[PDB]
Design a protein that fits this description.
By secondary structure, the chain is an all-beta fold. The protein folds into two domains: 83 residues, Gamma-B Crystallin, domain 1; 90 residues, Crystallins (Gamma-B Crystallin, domain 1). Helix content is 0%, strand content 43%. Strands 2-1-3-6 form a four-stranded antiparallel sheet, with no helix packed on it. The protein has a four-stranded antiparallel sheet with strand order 9-8-10-13, with no helix packed on it. Strand 1 and strand 2 form a beta hairpin. The chain starts with a strand and ends in a 5-residue tail after the last strand. It comes from Bos taurus. InterPro entries: Beta/Gamma-Crystallin, Beta/gamma_crystallin, G_crystallin-like.
Length: 173
């Protein structure tokens, strides 16, 4: 993985090239207004130690923070999302894996419209890392999901229960 942060928009100003996880980016730049990702899938955060609002980045240009749907130019930590050989997850109508269920292996752009049940309250990530979005079409607040149990919203770090879309974190070979 390779990512480069720039202090000004349009890839201008002081910049820092990165190839691994950093729990504290403060020593490298005080503001981040544009990012260019050369390889790998990344999750950037507003606070150190991967805390606070999180954002997903793929290869390519992010000329402004609005490109990654950020709230401001304060990025203090980054995570290179691990690569897995596959992706698999179960979606449940009720908490604690109760109610109707569907097992998926591909992206879902609208959680409340694609299945036979519209209420969504728990997830079981069996394989691969995914990004859960608050709104449909991969927008709104984001929550990175690594393999594990998510019997209720508190488990994925949300203070809100609103969900809308789900995408697999995948990069080319």
């Amino acid at each position: 993985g390779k990512i480069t942060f720039y202090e000004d928009r349009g890839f201008q100003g002081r910049h820092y090239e990165c190839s691994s996880d950093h729990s504290n980016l403060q020593p490298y730049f005080s503001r981040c207004n544009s990012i260019r990702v050369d390889s790998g899938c990344w999750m950037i955060y507003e606070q150190p130690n991967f805390q606070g609002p999180q954002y997903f980045l793929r290869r390519g240009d992010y000329p402004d923070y609005q490109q990654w749907m950020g709230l401001n130019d304060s990025i203090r930590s980054c995570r290179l999302i691990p690569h897995t050989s596959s992706h698999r997850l179960r979606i449940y109508e009720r908490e604690d894996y109760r109610g109707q269920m569907v097992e998926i292996t591909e992206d879902c752009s609208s959680l409340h419209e694609r299945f036979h049940f519209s209420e969504i309250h728990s997830f079981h990530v069996l394989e691969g890392w995914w990004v859960l979005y608050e709104m449909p079409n991969y927008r709104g607040r984001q929550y990175l999901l690594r393999p594990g149990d998510y019997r209720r919203y508190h488990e994925w770090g949300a203070v809100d229960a609103r969900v809308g879309s789900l995408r697999r974190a995948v990069d080319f070979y």
